[PDB]
């Protein structure tokens, strides 16, 4: 399985998109939480509140999920980061596989 | 070292279990924080607040830790996810090894 | 690219340090959020609120970033954890490379 991380400018867009990803069976679950982001907005250091999303899905759904997120994401250049899971309890993996495409 | 991620239905269960894991020297530290979880509860998309736990421990304590979490966790099928750390500052690794089993 | 995780005793130190890392172009962005930490303070289980920092930067900036964090961090033994990213959307990687050293 993999974890996929992306961030959204607000809760409205984060919830709309992850509900869509769940409806499309592209992810088994999403964990959303606020964070304060600091980055260069091409020119100057900017700070603002965003909603971080931790998505859990199958390894083989990565490319489709990545494409779908590009299509639905409010940002023109969103972050879509893949972290492979080295091991996981089997019953949970079974549940995740069953819940996804 | 590894990071192990699991989630709990509430703060009471998350704190009880991680304190137990620390008492048993199965982890060096735990970081707990709330998130909003969205997932299929087998049938329909559900939303609810949960407590995410980031556990830091030794690579060789993975299997024992995974088993202990299954035993203590309120969920019948909890998520117990292992992410290997590619590198870390040595003094911190030394502290983590000393604090664990 | 890599994710680098570290934690701070408070928001004042976390923001001061990540702004410095951005000014020095050692990271492309930082996501900060509070968590409750539980650990052995060498002797007894302690609990306290801390600020977790998720830093995103280039793979080849790891050693310099790790050294800089040791120098700036309020803790004498901070956690500086490196997690390699297995894949990421190309346009985001391009932005991250351009924003860093």
Swiss-Prot record, chains A, B, C:
The keyword Isomerase does not apply. It holds the Pfam family CutA1. The keyword Metal-binding applies. Disulfide bonds: none annotated. It comes from the Archaea. GO terms for cellular component: cytoplasm. Signal peptide: none annotated. Keywords: Copper, Cytoplasm, Metal-binding. Homotrimer. The binding of the copper ion probably leads to oligomerization. Involved in resistance toward heavy metals. PANTHER family: DIVALENT CATION TOLERANCE CUTA-RELATED, FI09726P. Belongs to the CutA family. This is Divalent-cation tolerance protein CutA. The gene is cutA.
